[PDB]
Nucleic acid binder design. Structure first.
Lengths: 92, 110, 108, 51, 104, 69
RNA sequence: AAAUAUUCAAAUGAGAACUUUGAAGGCCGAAGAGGAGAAAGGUUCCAUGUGAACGGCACUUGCACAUGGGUAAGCCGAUCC
RNA sequence: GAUGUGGCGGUUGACGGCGACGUUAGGAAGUCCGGAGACGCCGGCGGGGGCCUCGGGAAGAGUUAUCUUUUCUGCUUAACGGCCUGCCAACCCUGGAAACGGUUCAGCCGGAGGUAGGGUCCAGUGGCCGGAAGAGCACACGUCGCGCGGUGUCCGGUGCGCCCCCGGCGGCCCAUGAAAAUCCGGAGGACCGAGUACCGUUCACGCCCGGUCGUACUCAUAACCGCAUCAGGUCUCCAAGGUGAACAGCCUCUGGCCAAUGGAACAAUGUAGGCAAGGGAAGUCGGCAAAACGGAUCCGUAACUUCGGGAAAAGGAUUGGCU
């Protein structure tokens, strides 16, 4: 674009410092902090990070639990699915 | 110099409660006066937005005073407490639960 | 357009210490020559013809030019010390006393 | 703020101010004789008064 | 009292910066942006232009569609001044006018 | 002083009371008007017309110790 | 001997580079050598008297010594929390 | 704290307004629940006050050989109250949008109804009036004096100005930024409601009362702390004008000193400050500091690099008065 090759966020923050490996993890989780997410409730691409582990949708006002940096997590999907399956079979 | 401002009473620190605003006298002299902090908004608990129809002042003003009965309140229920579009949401909830409850009860016994 | 003038009638008053306490023909005489001198000759803010009549002990100048206001108090200060060791024998007031001026202005 | 208001200190300041007065001429006769050159008159610029 | 001012020297100098002058590199330059930060000047481009365009649409001299594209171009800063925008508005109207007569 | 009133009747009712009064007539000013000092609060009635103003001053109760100033 | 710096005339007094007044020259240069409050000191503030000691010069002057006076709050603070 | 007068309430515990909400009253026990007290820091932006800039105008002052309708200065309006008034934020109603719109420093208004039209609200603030000129300020005159009589004291303008405030936003975080006295509200409806009176007594008006303690003044190159009238140190508020980015330096206003023992010569030698032809670090353990470069605009910009930087690389040129 301008004087930008790839993108940064935190690469630009450093200067020369920190290093190539270190920026890989944190770049992914800081873009996630910035990242708009779609609410389950309203469906708008509103939801933003209220705090660590806390997400809040501005429009509907709905506050939701989630991962630290990101809306959900791979682990969260796994945990809910097994619980729902166990509940479904037992209730039968 | 320029007509100077000094801690006019006592308390010689620039605290939040002793933020000041300059006033000019009929003498033509500048001095600041002690002014209490500007009011926030009273919130509605569910939405978190400011509560309409309610003037907001220091609690000292807002209690048994020069003000008449009306100025503390709005006529509707939850006048100072909930915002008005918030009040109707709980009237709707009250309606839904009662009508649903009779339907649930008769279903279970049968 | 219309009528615009600055009609100042010049009054000489006897008050204040610094010599004696007297009047003189010279004070009203000085008024005319200096008015013409400072105002007249110009590229700038004026452009005028100076007309004068003289009363019993007042000289009245009506000039087809600038005002007669703030400007006339300012010009009189200049006249004082350019010539003649006096002045401090006048500058009374209360009311529009001293030299009274009436401003004729164009309508707007 | 005031200029330490507390009464306990305040009374001592009053007492010491009264105490820091010169010896009065007459008494030197009504002691018999002995040089009554006080001692308990102090000056503020030098020393320090403890409470 | 005790002496006097020195407004008279200063005011004439200010009047000589009201009238061009003495604004070559040497005398006029302290540290870089700080004389007038230039951020506010960029915002001034947004503000002046958006008032003019908004006034035109709501008074009805242009259509809403003409406003819509023009507003986005102002954000891009494709117009740097009061003028050049003036030509653009009139050009837009003329092109759409030529289109409209062709359509009917 | 806190209040200016325009109702003649309201002024008159206060005026009959014991509390006090003072009255001002002078040049055309902010200052000029008929003032009634009630104990906590002061009501001021500005009578614009000269004739009516003079009558208002005449209407003043004889027992009350009103200040001419 | 750091801190840009004094000088002239008058007043007074036994006595005046230094006091006091004028005139003049300057200086701090409004993040002040400024107007005030905190803290601290405790009467130092001011009058009047006034040079024994003290202001490492001087001195009739003093933040000195002597003699007097002065700090008034329903609303400012403490208090209350 | 006492009360009396008026009004409030017989639809028994007020109406009007589409509503948002308006107003001189307009029951409310136990209890409940909320909100107020009540909140970080930085950035830019908005509006306000004062200060700054400036024209006209009414007074006094100065320049005043000479020139200048020039220059300087007073020109003020409170707490508190009335009436009126704030946009952002927010909310109500109309209406039904695709050639989708308005709009933020983060995409947020509107598809759970916008843009647009008409309202409503928070009342910082200004206005005009009350305060309040009866004051104060500047003049003239008077000694008629410990004080006399008169006026005039007004009306505009401008913004990246300066300071502070206040508003609503935005950045930040594995950091998400107190609590209480103080305190009203609503929900709650028990209980008590009368008529020639009883009920309201969060209303207006009237009557009385308000105790305890501190208040001098300095706040520092001399009232504090370092034995001390010590060049040191010591928390905070106000912050003019120019040049200029400047709350830099320098000069000055306003405020404050003129007391830094004084005089004479002004030697070497010191200490502190400058400059030197030609040469240019050969000096020296060593470029130690003196000295030079320096601000900015334009041009130009390296091997290398975690691609963010180096970078103001280097290196050059330019820079006034005035019209």
């Amino acid at each position: 674009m301008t004087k930008r090759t790839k993108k940064a966020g935190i690469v630009g923050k450093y200067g020369t410092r920190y290093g190539a490996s270190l920026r890989k993890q944190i770049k992914k989780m800081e873009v996630s902090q910035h990242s708009k997410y779609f609410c389950e409730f309203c469906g708008k691409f509103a939801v933003k990070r209220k705090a660590v582990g806390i997400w809040g949708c501005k429009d509907c006002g709905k506050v939701k639990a989630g991962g630290a940096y990101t809306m959900n997590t791979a682990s969260a999907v796994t945990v809910r699915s097994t619980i729902r399956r166990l509940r479904e079979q037992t209730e039968a | 110099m320029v007509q100077r401002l000094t801690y006019r009473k006592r308390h010689s620190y620039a605290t939040k409660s002793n933020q000041t605003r300059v006033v000019k006298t009929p003498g033509g002299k500048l001095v600041y006066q002690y002014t209490k902090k500007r009011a926030s908004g009273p919130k509605c608990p569910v939405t978190g937005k400011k509560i309409q129809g309610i003037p907001h002042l220091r609690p000292t003003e807002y209690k048994r005073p020069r003000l008449s009965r009306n100025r503390r309140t709005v006529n509707r229920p939850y006048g100072g407490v909930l915002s008005g579009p918030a009040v109707r949401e709980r009237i709707i909830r009250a309606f839904l639960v009662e009508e649903q409850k009779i339907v649930k009860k008769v279903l279970k016994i049968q | 357009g219309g009528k615009k003038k600055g009609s100042v009638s010049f009054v000489i008053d006897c008050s204040k210490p610094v010599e004696d306490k007297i009047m003189e023909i010279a004070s009203l005489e000085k008024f005319l020559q200096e008015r013409i001198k400072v105002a007249g000759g110009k590229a700038g803010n004026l452009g005028d013809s100076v007309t004068v009549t003289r009363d019993k002990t007042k000289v009245t100048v009506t000039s087809d030019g600038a005002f007669s206001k703030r400007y006339l108090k300012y010009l009189t200060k200049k006249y004082l010390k350019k010539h003649n060791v006096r002045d401090w024998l006048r500058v009374i007031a209360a009311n529009k006393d001293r030299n009274v001026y009436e401003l004729r202005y164009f309508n707007i | 703020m005031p200029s330490h208001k507390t009464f306990r200190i305040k009374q001592k300041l009053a007492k010491k101010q009264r105490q820091n007065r010169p010896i009065p001429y007459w008494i030197r006769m009504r002691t018999d004789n002995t040089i009554r050159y006080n001692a308990k008159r102090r000056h503020w610029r030098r020393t320090k008064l403890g409470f | 009292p005790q002496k006097i001012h020195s407004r008279s020297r200063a005011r004439r100098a200010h009047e000589a910066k009201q009238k061009g002058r003495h604004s070559g590199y040497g005398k006029r330059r302290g540290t870089r942006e700080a004389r007038l930060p230039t951020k506010i000047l960029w915002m001034r481009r947004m503000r002046v232009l958006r008032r003019l365009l908004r006034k035109y649409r709501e008074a009805k001299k242009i259509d809403k569609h003409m406003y819509h594209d023009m507003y986005l171009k102002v954000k891009g800063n494709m117009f740097k001044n009061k003028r050049v925008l003036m030509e653009s508005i009139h050009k837009s109207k003329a092109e759409k006018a030529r289109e409209k007569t062709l359509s009917d | 002083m806190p209040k200016q009133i325009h109702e003649i009747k309201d002024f008159l009712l206060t005026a009959r009371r014991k509390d006090a009064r003072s009255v001002r007539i002078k040049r055309t000013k902010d200052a000029v008007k008929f003032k009634v000092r009630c104990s906590k609060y002061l009501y001021t009635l500005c009578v614009f017309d000269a004739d009516k103003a003079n009558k208002l001053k005449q209407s003043l109760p004889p027992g009350l110790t009103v200040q001419e100033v």
